[PDB]
Amino acid sequence: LERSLNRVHLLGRVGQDPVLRQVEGKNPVTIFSLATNEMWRSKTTWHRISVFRPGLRDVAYQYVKKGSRIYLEGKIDYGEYMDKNNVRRQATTIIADNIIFLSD
Amino acid sequence: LERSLNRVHLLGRVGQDPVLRQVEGKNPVTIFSLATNEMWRSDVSQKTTWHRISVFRPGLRDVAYQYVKKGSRIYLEGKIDYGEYMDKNNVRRQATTIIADNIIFLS
């Protein structure tokens, strides 16, 4: 039923120590934050990263640490929800599939 | 500073005709959406993600504008850019766009 590509490739500095959270009652995730730099002539982007994957999440919990440089691949998910039911807002996260640990 | 990456590779079908945006008295933007299908086994659960594609680059803005249509299959590469506006209190939101710098038309 025909295929697509959604893949973001990031390489940056992790900005917070990972957080363990729980999506719905039973979907564990560790979430952290990563900064990218727009090096332009003549300015930081902060990405929110979610690792839902059953082994890759435990590993990025003990090994991701603020100031670590990391290369990472995944999917964009815009995470749209209604706020206090009213305004439709979006909470976009990069859902990581691959984290190659650079320091250490 | 030291090199960072922010690249998005996307391939899919355009969801609407492009829209040029010169509202203010600024820099014009071609805007369209792109659908991407995520379908996963373990089971087969289908999911579609709609992405807001912006192209500012002088030239590719124009090509994107006359040539992409609703229906076109397309490959592009960009950067994720969040909305980043401090909406109320300072209680901000976003309105994230992929800003395209390369569009390959699959025909």
Could you give all domains of chain A from N- to C-terminal order, each with its CATH number? 1-104 (2.40.50.140)
Instruction: Record the tokens describing residue A13, joined without a space.
Output: 């500095």
**Angular region, A52: left φ>0, alpha ψ -120 to 50, beta rest:** alpha
CA atoms of B27 and B56, how far apart (whole Å) = 8
User: Which residues of chain B neighbour A46 with C-beta distances below 8 Å?
Assistant: 82
Instruction: Read off the amino acid at residue B66.
Output: Q
In A, which residues are within 8 Å of B81 by CB distance? 45
CA nearest to B50 within chain A: A78
* Residues in chain B within 8 Å Cβ distance of A38: 6, 79
3 state DSSP class of B9: strand
CA angle B102, B61, B12 (to 5 degrees): 50
Question: What is the 3 state secondary structure string of A3-72?
Answer: CCEEEEEEEEEECCCCEEEEECCCEEEEEEEEEEECCCCCCEEEEEEEECCCCHHHHHHHHCCCCCEEEE
**DSSP character for B15?**
-
- Which residue from B58, B63, B69, B87 is spatially nearest to A90, judged by alpha carbons? B87
Residue A77 at interface with chain B, using a CB cutoff of 8 Å: yes
Are β-strands B45-55 and B97-105 bridged in parallel, bridged antiparallel, or unpaired? Answer: parallel
Of the candidates A3, A5, A11, the beta carbon closest to that of B5 is on A11
Considering only CB atoms, which chain B residues are within 8 Å of A42?
none
Kindly provide the resolution of this structure in angstroms, with one decimal. 2.5
Q: Which two three-digit tokens encode residue A19?
A: 């957080």
Are B6 and A10 inside 8 Å of each other by CB? yes
Residue with tokens 């500095």: A13
**Per-residue tokens: A83:** 């706020």
Q: Taking CA atoms, what residue in A is nearest to B92?
A: A89
CB-based contact, A35 to chain B, within 8 Å = yes
Is the CB of residue A29 less than 8 Å from the CB of residue A22? yes
Q: Containing H/E element for A95?
A: strand A93-101
Answer for the pair A47, A32: CB distance below 8 angstroms, yes or no: no
Question: What burial class does residue A27 get, using C-beta atoms within 10 Å of its C-beta: 0-12 exposed, 13-18 middle, 19+ buried?
Answer: exposed
**A20 lies within 8 A of chain B by CB:** no
**What chain A residue is nearest to B51 in terms of C-alpha separation?**
A78
Q: Which of B1, B2, B3, B4 to mutate to test the interface with A (most CBs of A within 10 A)?
A: B4
User: In degrees, to the nearest 5, what angle opens at C-alpha B91 toward C-alphas B85 and B92?
Assistant: 25
CA dihedral B57, B58, B62, B67 (to 10 degrees): -40
Q: In chain B, what is the straight-line distance between the N-terminal and C-terminal CA atoms, in Å?
A: 39
| C-alpha B27, offset from chain centre | 17
Give the method of determination.
X-ray
Q: Is residue B98 within 8 Å of residue B51, measured between CB atoms?
A: yes
For chain A, first and last CA: distance in Å? 42
3-state secondary structure of B63: helix
Phi/psi of residue B73, nearest 5 degrees: -85, 140
